[PDB]
Amino acid sequence: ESLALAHADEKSLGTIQQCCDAIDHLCRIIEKKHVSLNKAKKRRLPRGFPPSASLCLLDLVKWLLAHCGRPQTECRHKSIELFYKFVPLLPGNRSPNLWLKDVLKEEGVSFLINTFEGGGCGQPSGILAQPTLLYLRGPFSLQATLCWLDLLLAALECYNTFIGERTVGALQVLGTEAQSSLLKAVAFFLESIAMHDIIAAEKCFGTGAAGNRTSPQEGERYNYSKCTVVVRIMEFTTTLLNTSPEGWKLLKKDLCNTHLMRVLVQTLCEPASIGFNIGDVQVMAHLPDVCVNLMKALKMSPYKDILETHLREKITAQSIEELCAVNLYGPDAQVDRSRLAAVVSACKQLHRAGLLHNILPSQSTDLHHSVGTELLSLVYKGIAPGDERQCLPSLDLSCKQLA
Amino acid sequence: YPQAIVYPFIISSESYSFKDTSTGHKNKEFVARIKSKLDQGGVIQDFINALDQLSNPELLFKDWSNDVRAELAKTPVNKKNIEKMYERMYAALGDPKAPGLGAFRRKFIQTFGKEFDKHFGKGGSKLLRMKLSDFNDITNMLLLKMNKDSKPPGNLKECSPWMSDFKVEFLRNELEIPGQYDGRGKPLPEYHVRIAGFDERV
Structure with missing residues (x-):
């Protein structure tokens, strides 16, 4: 609970690190004394x-499983960690x-659904x-809108973790047995909230009936949480496709596969249009890897x-x-240079x-790639003075890099 | 700003009246709408009950000796207005199980509820029925209450479970420390310090 309380902190203090070390020490204590506990x-x-009157380790693992759907990030990660590390130490070895x-x-499955989606x-x-940000009430504020995104992040994390490790089948856990609300939230975020800004998050004069204002840092704070969810959606789709051979039928329940392709190809051509902020290499380094993994999942x-x-229209x-x-x-005209760099990176x-050949296939069929030849010729003749002037x-640092 | 209005509104709404004209009905409807928009959430009433559980549970009875003694005598017209008195006590002193109830008030209930029930019984009818100097039994009740309090309640767990196990979770249980809307020279941000927890020692 202290780790969950340290959510609204900064990484420079060390509270997360010290609490995690304490939890690992405790974990080792139960792992060395499970037969007596x-x-x-x-x-x-x-x-x-x-x-109650008597306490068992089974009650502790049930508490961990129930609290696995915590909106807080590090506490939920540790909840899943303790759950997976403590299930084998039951009376059985299952x-x-x-x-x-x-x-x-x-x-029934409804217990697991309420555990994952209970927030x-x-x-x-x-x-x-x-399920959507339309269910909320009161004056909209930057603090309140991020809570929905945190709940969606938690639900995505628990579902991905419990599907990718072959714990519960995807059809069994998110099929047509009961209400799920996960596909609905994903479709609402991908279609109506993604590829937009905070002015679209606040809708347009809804039940609040107040234009209010928006601080410049509020936009970045909203954009960080907005871009955090699209990535987890991409690994969710990749995990579903890679794990479930019949997962395309469940993927049809997204009802927004066109919008999923929209956000994918928009992350391809220019990530900063969606809201991905430059400045930190850690966030933008993971983007090409998850994009490539999603592509290899969709190709098979x-x-x-589709x-x-x-x-094709994008590239x-x-x-x-x-x-x-x-x-x-x-x-001058650095915008053309930036667009060419974005295109070549895509x-x-x-x-x-x-998939490079399929997006841009050969059009000459003379054992020599059409587009690559012209690119070679452009690079080889662009360093020449040209004509007789x-x-x-x-060449500067950027021009040499683009060449 | 639904808090700097909600506290004086709860203070004022205890004593209201309305006329039978159309303007009175309009005022009643408007007060109903204001209460409807102000009573949402329920955190304020939970806070009020939790803070009321910290009250000494015999002094509230001692002020009873200050209140119904005003009824005693005079009263060319006794009236039926004392019907809210018994509801006010039984919602706070006579109920064996009330929201936010701690162990201290529960012990006081378990040790005096049957006592004053057999002392008067159906207090609404009996109090108006009998009107004489027989009310000297307040001393007999109050001496026992004064020697029955014994130790102070101490920590918050014995006082109020709500305050001891208070927890702020997402999208609900929003509470603000009272006394932050100065209302002078400037509008207020609403950054206002919010309640996160209570120290366990009282």
Whole structure:
């Protein structure tokens, strides 16, 4: 609970680190003494636990599983960590898959759905209480709007962690058995909130009926949380496609695959249009890797045609030809240089996934790639003075990098 | 700003009246709407009850000796206005189980509820029925209450479970420390310090 309380802190203090080390020390203490803690003795009752006479380790792992859907990030990560590390130390030696089978069997899938979508524990909340940001009430503030995004992040994290490790089948856990609200929240965020700004998050004169203002740092604070969810959506889609051979039917429940391709190809061409802020290498380094993994997941699925179709307008063999030589090597017009760099970076990312030929295929069929030849010729002749004006082009750090 | 209005509104709404004209009905409807927009959440009433559980549970009875003694005598018209008195006590002293109830008030209830029930019984009818100097039994009740308090309650867990196990979670349980809207020379940010917890020692 202290780790959960340290959510609204800064990484420079060290509270997260020290609390994590304390939790690992405790974890080692139970891991070295589980056979004595398994028997139901009479022990002190921790805060938040229901009243009882005897405490077992099974009650602790049930508490961890119930609190696995915590909106706080580090506490939820540690909750899943303790859950997976403590399930084997039960009276049996069953894997978490078999344990969740019988626990799911005793209480149906709805127990797991309420655990994942409950937004914590106790009172019903989370995306099940508020699937969209239209369910909220009161004057809209920058503090309140991020809570929905945190709840969506928590739900995505628990679902991804419990699906990717072969713990519960995707069809069993998010099929048509009962209400899920996860696909609805994902579709609402991808279509209505993604590829937008905070002015679209505040809708347009809703029930608040107040224009108010918006601080410059409020935009960045909203954009960080906004860009955090699209990434987790990409790993969620990748995990579903890679784990479930029949997962395309469940992916059809997204109802916004066109919008998913929209955000994917917009993250390709220019990530900063969505809201991805420059300045930190850590956030932007993970983006090409998850994009390539998502591409390789979609390519081995019955979604290749729609991905390719949505991709061609964004990257076209004629657009690169018409943009690659427009007043190049000049002291001005840096926007053309930036656009060419973005296009070539998108082409590299397409080559990483193995779709470069399909997006930009050969048009000459003479054992020599059409686009690559022209790019070579452009680079080899762009360093020449050209004609007979006796002017040798100069190259700077950016021009050499783009060449 | 729904707090600097909500505290004086709760103070004022205890004693209201309304006429039978159209303007009175309009005022009643407007007060109803204001209460509807002001009573949302329920955190304020929980805070009020939790703070009321810290009250000494015999002094509240001692002020009873200050209140119904005003009824005793005079009263050419006794009236039925004392019907809210018994509800006010039984919602705070006579109920064996009330929201926010701690162990101290529970012990006081378990040790005096049957006592004053057999002392008067159905106090609404009996109090208006009998009007004489028989009310000297308040001393008999109050001496026992004064020697029954014994130690102070001490920590918050024995006083009020709500204050001891208060916890601020997302999108609900929003509470602000009272006395921050000065209302002078400037508008207020609403950054205003909010309540996060209570120290366990009283």
